[PDB]
């Protein structure tokens, strides 16, 4: 019955742990010990964007590194021109509890979702010049946490009912379901080639999925609490996570285990968002203590602070050309650092 | 093209300043515990009540998006200890630490609560009612710091007078917040 299956599961976990341990030939700290440190990374606020009445839960850069979208909990979706701080669009939502937003890589669409369990797609390039809804996707039994466009016709959404899904926007129907988690799925990150993605959940584990076959390939367990953020390394062979234990960790897909830990004894608040610089040398991470920190991803040494917000930092992103960083926060202000 | 962008920004800003007026003059309420949106108006002031019945049983992630709500309406009828524990976890949350609670005791005994044998307020039902109210108030008045309070009520009828009560406690909440900001309370 159940006892035999539990014993076999314990034996398999022991075997996997032994196989992982046999590959710990060295550590990342030893290899990168003779590398010159980065120095001191000082950034200054360039722009401050003020149009939101309530707290901001999400943001996302456009692929041209100039336009970005932001979502706030007053029920508004605003598209900014970061260069001139002008507003291009302002979209009202049917639900005021919006928890995520995405920008299509072609720039023609925009998505959002939240506590209403629905992903809504908005057509920016209207023939008539007015932004109106294009499709509503309804197949989840829990709040929506993240969404990411694969192309103009596919989107991957993660939800609080412990599942992810791949959608078909034209027909508005689910294509595949990824069912392996045991808690709310909080984030996801697409690989650069968009053939795999990772997801972190509230069971303190992250999984690597394959889009084309819809299976789970690897499971990573290093954290001690819920995982709030996740991001891919630029070459797509590693990823970084941030959880509620005030630590960030770097995992490697080929070694199938954890490499580095980014923690300090003065930090006792959870991480809400992580991101990477263009070369993968810096690791940006937003915290609950109202400011972001810059880490040296190769040496695990803090190299800067981004302290300009008056409340919890909820979102964080770096442009595709790596020329600016945008951070939103619960005080309803976006700031662009450089 | 800069003129057209400036004009579009002007229209957006004009609409935003008009929407901010409606947003700030409305009071949003959460109705967890027991019994989606509902817009009702009492004495020319609009209220906006939400009920979150369509989710799962894990509350620690979607509860922190209700941190700017004016009040939380908690309806509570060992089913009592679970309600007490939920109240104690809501009260001490890091993000709901300045939210007031309007408590509706919808029910209107020593084996599960042994402290009842030595509690002094048919008078027996009033003693039981005030025991339960005192348990909830003993949780609330222990870690407040003065930024939120609890307003308990007894509700059992067809609820003909349950809407004026929320009005009255939402007025007291704002009056106390302003009096405390002016260093007067």
């Amino acid at each position: 019955e159940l006892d035999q299956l539990r014993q076999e599961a314990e034996q398999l976990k022991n075997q996997i742990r032994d196989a992982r341990k046999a590959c710990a030939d060295a550590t990342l700290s030893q290899i990168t010990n003779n590398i010159d440190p980065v120095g001191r990374i000082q950034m200054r606020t360039r722009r401050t964007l003020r149009g939101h009445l309530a707290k901001i839960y999400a943001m996302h850069w456009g692929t041209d590194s100039r336009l970005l979208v932001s979502a706030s909990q007053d029920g508004k979706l605003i598209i900014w021109d970061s260069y001139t701080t002008n507003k291009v669009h302002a979209i009202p939502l049917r639900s005021s509890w919006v928890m995520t937003c995405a920008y299509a890589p072609s720039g023609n669409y925009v998505a959002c979702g939240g506590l209403d369990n629905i992903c809504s797609i908005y057509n920016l390039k209207t023939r008539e010049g007015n932004v109106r809804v294009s499709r509503e996707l309804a197949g989840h039994t829990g709040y929506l946490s993240c969404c990411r466009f694969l192309d103009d016709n596919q989107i991957v959404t993660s939800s609080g009912d412990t599942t992810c899904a791949l959608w078909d926007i034209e027909t508005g129907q689910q294509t595949t379901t990824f069912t392996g988690h045991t808690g709310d799925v909080m984030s996801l990150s697409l690989a650069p080639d968009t053939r795999l993605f990772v997801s972190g959940a509230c069971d303190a584990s992250a999984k690597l999925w394959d889009v084309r076959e819809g299976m789970c390939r690897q499971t990573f367990t290093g954290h001690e609490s819920d995982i709030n953020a996740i991001c891919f390394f630029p070459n797509g062979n590693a990823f970084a996570t941030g959880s509620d234990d005030a630590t960030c960790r770097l995992f490697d897909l080929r070694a199938d285990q954890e490499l580095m830990t980014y923690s300090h004894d003065n930090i006792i608040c959870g991480i809400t968002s992580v991101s990477f610089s263009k070369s993968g040398r810096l690791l940006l991470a937003g915290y609950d203590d109202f400011n972001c920190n810059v880490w040296d991803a190769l040496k695990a040494d803090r190299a800067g602070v981004l302290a300009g917000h008056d409340n919890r930092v909820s979102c964080l992103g770096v442009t595709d050309d790596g020329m600016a960083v945008a951070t939103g926060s619960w005080d309803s202000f976006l700031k662009i650092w450089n | 093209e800069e003129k057209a962008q400036r004009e579009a920004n002007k229209k957006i800003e004009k609409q935003l300043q008009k929407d901010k007026q409606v947003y700030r003059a409305t009071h949003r309420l959460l109705l967890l515990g027991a019994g989606f949106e509902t817009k009702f108006q009492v004495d020319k002031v609009n209220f906006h009540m939400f009920d979150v019945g369509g989710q799962r049983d894990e509350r620690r992630k979607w509860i922190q998006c209700f941190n700017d709500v004016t009040a939380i309406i908690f309806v509570v009828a060992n089913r009592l200890q679970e309600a007490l524990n939920l109240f104690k976890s809501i009260w001490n949350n890091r993000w709901l630490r300045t939210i007031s609670v309007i408590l509706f005791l919808n029910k209107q005994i020593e084996d599960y609560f042994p402290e009842f044998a030595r509690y002094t307020t048919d008078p027996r039902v009033t003693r039981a009612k005030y025991f339960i109210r005192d348990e909830f108030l003993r949780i609330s008045t222990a870690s407040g710091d003065g930024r939120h309070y609890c307003y308990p009520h007894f509700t059992c009828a067809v609820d003909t007078e349950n809407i004026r009560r929320v009005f009255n406690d939402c007025r007291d909440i704002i009056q106390r917040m302003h009096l405390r900001q002016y260093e007067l309370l």
Partner: nanobody
Amino acid sequence: QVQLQESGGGLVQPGGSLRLSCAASGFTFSNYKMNWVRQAPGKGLEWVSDISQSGASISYTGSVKGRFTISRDNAKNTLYLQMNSLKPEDTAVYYCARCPAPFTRDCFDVTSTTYAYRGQGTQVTV
């Protein structure tokens, strides 16, 4: 990997005494508040006791107040529950839960159907 393994228990006569144990690994035991949760056969999960990060603050449910004692050992990473003066009602499966996040004063969702930071349980019969 956060693992909590409970041991101890079995069958006792009414008025007997047991001592449940919970060995923790995969996390720093000192920064979290731990609890005990039970599930009687036929009903849902019921909260029983909890203890603070240092052992200063302790709470019990009404039905077990006076005859259950909870204590923790931060050096050995163990959590104990002392059950004396047992009653025929106390037969259940006892779980060893944990607050979701460190340093917080609130335990959320500990008695949920699918909670990821609690053990597999030990059967106690009276």
